[PDB]
Amino acid sequence: SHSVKIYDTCIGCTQCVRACPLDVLEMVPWDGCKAAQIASSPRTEDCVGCKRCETACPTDFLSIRVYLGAETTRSMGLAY
Amino acid sequence: SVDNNPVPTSFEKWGKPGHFDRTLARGPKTTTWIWNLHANAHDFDSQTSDLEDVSRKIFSAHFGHLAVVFVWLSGMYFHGAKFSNYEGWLADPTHIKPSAQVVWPIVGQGILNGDVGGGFHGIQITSGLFYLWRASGFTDSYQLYCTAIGGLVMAALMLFAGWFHYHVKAPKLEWFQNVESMMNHHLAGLLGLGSLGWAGHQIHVSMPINKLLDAGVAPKDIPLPHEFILEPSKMAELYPSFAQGLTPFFTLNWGVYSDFLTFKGGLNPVTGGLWLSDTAHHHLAIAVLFIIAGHMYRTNWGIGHSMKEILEAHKGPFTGEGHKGLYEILTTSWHAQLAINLALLGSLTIIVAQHMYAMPPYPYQAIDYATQLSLFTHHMWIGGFLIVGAGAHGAIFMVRDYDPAKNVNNLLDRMLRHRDAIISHLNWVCIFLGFHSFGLYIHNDTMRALGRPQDMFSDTAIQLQPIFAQWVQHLHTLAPGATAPNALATASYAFGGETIAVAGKVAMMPITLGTADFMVHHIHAFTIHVTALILLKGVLYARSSRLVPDKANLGFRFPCDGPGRGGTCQVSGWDHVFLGLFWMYNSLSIVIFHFSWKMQSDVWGTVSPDGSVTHVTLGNFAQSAITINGWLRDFLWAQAANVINSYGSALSAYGIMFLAGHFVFAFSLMFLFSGRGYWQELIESIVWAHNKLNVAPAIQPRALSIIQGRAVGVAHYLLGGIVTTWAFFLARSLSIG
Amino acid sequence: LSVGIIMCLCNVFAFVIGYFAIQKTGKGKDLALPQLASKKTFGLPELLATMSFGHILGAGMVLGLAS
Amino acid sequence: DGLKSFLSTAPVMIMALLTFTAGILIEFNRFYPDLLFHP
């Protein structure tokens, strides 16, 4: 599976979660930002590596980072 | 239903680029803005969401395009009248080559003003304008000047019509949606009445000076085209059917007109063109059939057809609800109409190219081998580009204008439901065709290289005779008298007959079909199938696939959906257009190479007075075109000697473009093999260097987008290759002689 | 030039066929208001369409008979 | 006054300057051709 990490520059705009087409990310409560929410990735075994969440992230040097690792049927997006 | 003054005419919005796009109107921040601007100009469906204003913009743009075409045609007539030798060529066709471009003496470029005949110095034009002008009955420079002035006036009229139909009086949507009347108005109108008027022009004007110039009358001794219509006695002097007037037309006695409206077939053996009586009778029959066709659909009087009802009645046990809904698609989506029109117009331009060489309709065009090769290749390339654009706009319709709720169990929905079966079978066909044509060539190269010529695929070895094409050629040869009793000669002498030998040169002979023709025709079948596979997979999978199920949300033109799922770069419909462009380029390069080699080897050449023909490349196509090495050595290497030994002569410009296209193709590979991350980091280093001397621009420079990098790559690739082939073909065929 | 008159008068088989096969006859803008038994029964554009079709089959018939 | 700024757009100025420089070069060649050095 691929690794999705969320760093402490997250400002809780939820745009990475909205952009994710495979339901990898949620928003959990937090205290480090004014929105008081941070993105989380409990479902990285369903992550395909499309990096739409990275494209959606507005913080300069994005607070969400996707690292392509071990390749599975789910991660290669195979319907067969 | 016409609006009154919708858009005011002001000069202020000309000075603010990016007014049409909301994001572009904020101003430039990155350089991509500029590259977005030209990219977003004509995408009218994206700027405004209402179909009405999109139709207004399209109508005014069509008028502007017609104005541009009229400006081009007016320039052609002006260059044929002032800076040409149409005078001089017309009295002596086969001593003087056509030339309609005169180039100033500057920096040594006056060498390109070559000796073409009759004390003239200019570029030998190969477009065939002189042969069409002779076929229309043109005989003076002043009339060509009048045609140029009329073209300028019609271009001004088109510009005024576009301004009027966008800014002053503009139609509504149901004017555009009334396609039942539009098809009647285009069939019985444009095509039918245009061909009726041209048949009338043929019979009255183009036929007399043509037949007098074929008889031997000097062009100054033929007075002027209007004095024939001033005095009808000249027609009865020349065509004696003009004695009963219009009486046999209305009294079912059309056999009186079987003196200027004939069914001869073949070619005129003074010029090599088609018979003008044959073309006039053809145009008259086309006119009558088109008038009949342009009364099919109900427009305003309750008589006719409903295209919706015709479509809805066509359904079967295999096809569910059949053609239900296609009227709504083709009346609401401009892109769907553009796709099907581009497909049929590209196929038509290719049909024009294939029909024009074997039945040359213009006098002395056939013996001008440069003109024949140029016209064939130009019309082939135009047709192939339009077919790629058809695949493009089919994918664009699929992304933008398709609606699933309004296409349930019709033909289009069932296409989308069995696209896997379609594309997989087309994939298998493409692999089968690639093997059983190109691997035949590879087999032949290997067996010839191994010293086993008896094991090759050839006429002198294992034979692949195109027996069905030979049988159809035989049936066309026994057509005129058995299955075409009133036809005198065959439809074309390429099917079988005798060689027309206008001047010392050849115009047409029986084009025989052997093993090499079989091999190259299956190569054509293969390459067309692969281009079709690419474009049809781009259309059928523009919305979704098993890889990207939400591709329609990403749009028509997007680079990728990221490195994930293994990697999804070039999944969009636009990237299928990008790949199909290269494959169409490959297909048409092979088609025109086949044409050039076969015409130089088995058709064109010099006829002896005894009746023998010495061909240009002496019949090498039967033994050399079966190997890749033969194509490399006897076609490319041998015939490129004219384009590379052109320096210091009038053909040296064809040398320069032969280099120049070789540049651009290679330049294209920079954009085609690389990616924008490297170029963006390099740009960062150069911006740091600009920051050091305070020359940093306010608009920040960026690398090109991934889509734009692919677009620049494919554009430069096709441009360089086409310019190379153009230079090679023209310097070969201006030196064939 | 007399038998062709009888052939392009027996062309009225087109009128007969259009009487019993045209879906919409009396609908047009100008509909030939003095309606009668067999000359202007359905309307002006129906009559125009049937006379054009009659001329088409009349031309076909006369050039088929004239071998 | 929008036409003045429409001419002031970058492609119009760069094409006008290119035509001006090309005219200068073509005129200097057609007056005095064939210069490879300083005589």
Ligand code: CLA
């Ligand atoms: C002098 C008369 C005049 C004036 C003041 C305007 C002014 C305007 N037009 Mg307009 N138009 C004109 C003539 C004119 N047009 C003509 C003759 C046509 C018919 C082709 C049109 C067709 C037209 C359409 C279809 C649209 C406009 C739009 C607009 C508005 C936005 C400005 C614009 O298009 O960006 C400035 C653009 C340019 C300066 C582009 C120049 C032309 C490029 C280079 C292509 C060249 C082809 C050309 C159109 C025709 C051939 C030229 C000829 C020499 C052969 C603006 C109010 C648009 C609108 O409503 O805005 C939202 C719009 O959609 N016009």
Ligand code: CLA
């Ligand atoms: C009847 C013909 C026709 C019509 C009406 C359209 C209309 C349209 N096409 Mg389309 N297309 C056509 C033919 C046509 N095309 C053909 C034949 C092809 C195959 C090559 C395509 C491929 C194509 C693609 C791939 C795309 C479109 C797009 C579009 C839309 C916007 C156009 C645009 O961006 O303008 C602006 C156009 C440009 C900036 C291109 C200019 C640069 C070209 C490549 C230069 C070509 C080189 C030139 C001939 C010689 C260079 C000389 C130089 C050395 C000086 C519009 C609906 C685009 C779109 O947005 O879809 C909705 C899109 O993505 N079309």
Ligand code: CLA
């Ligand atoms: C000369 C270069 C070249 C070659 C050989 C191919 C080959 C192929 N391309 Mg292709 N392509 C190329 C350049 C080339 N491409 C370029 C430059 C582009 C960029 C635009 C593309 C883009 C492209 C696309 C977008 C598509 C293809 C497709 C295809 C396939 C067509 C089906 C076919 O012919 O199967 C038969 C295979 C051949 C004719 C290849 C040669 C086989 C030789 C003669 C036999 C060898 C014998 C034996 C196996 C040797 C083994 C040795 C032993 C020691 C092991 C085929 C695999 C299409 C495809 O997959 O459709 C099915 C497709 O959709 N290509």
Ligand SMILES: CCCCCCCCCCCCCCCC(=O)OC[C@H](COP(=O)(O)OC[C@@H](O)CO)OC(=O)CCCCCCCCCCCCCCC
């Ligand atoms: C080169 C010439 C000599 C070789 C010819 C070889 C012919 C090849 C085999 C026949 C193809 C049959 C398709 C027609 C038969 C056909 O139209 O059936 C008719 C049927 C539609 O039946 P309905 O009665 O539902 O149709 C009502 C219609 O009005 C549509 O609603 O269509 C289908 O079932 C679609 C499936 C086609 C599946 C076949 C795919 C074709 C792939 C092969 C294409 C090859 C063309 C080669 C020649 C150019």
Ligand SMILES: CCCCCCCCCCCCCCCC(=O)OC[C@H](COP(=O)(O)OC[C@@H](O)CO)OC(=O)CCCCCCCCCCCCCCC
């Ligand atoms: C044989 C000769 C060579 C022909 C080869 C051409 C291959 C066909 C390529 C078409 C793809 C483009 C269709 C739009 C697809 C598309 O938009 O292109 C892709 C690219 C921008 O696409 P992106 O996806 O980056 O756009 C993002 C936007 O969609 C959102 O802002 O556009 C350009 O490259 C802009 C540069 C145009 C350069 C402007 C220079 C001026 C040239 C105008 C002169 C033209 C000729 C005039 C007549 C002489």
Ligand code: SF4
């Ligand atoms: S890479 Fe794609 S699938 Fe993975 S978390 Fe990001 S958006 Fe979701």
Ligand code: SF4
């Ligand atoms: S290589 Fe380029 S086009 Fe391919 S997935 Fe990565 S970013 Fe997208």
Ligand SMILES: [Cl-]
């Ligand atoms: Cl060889």
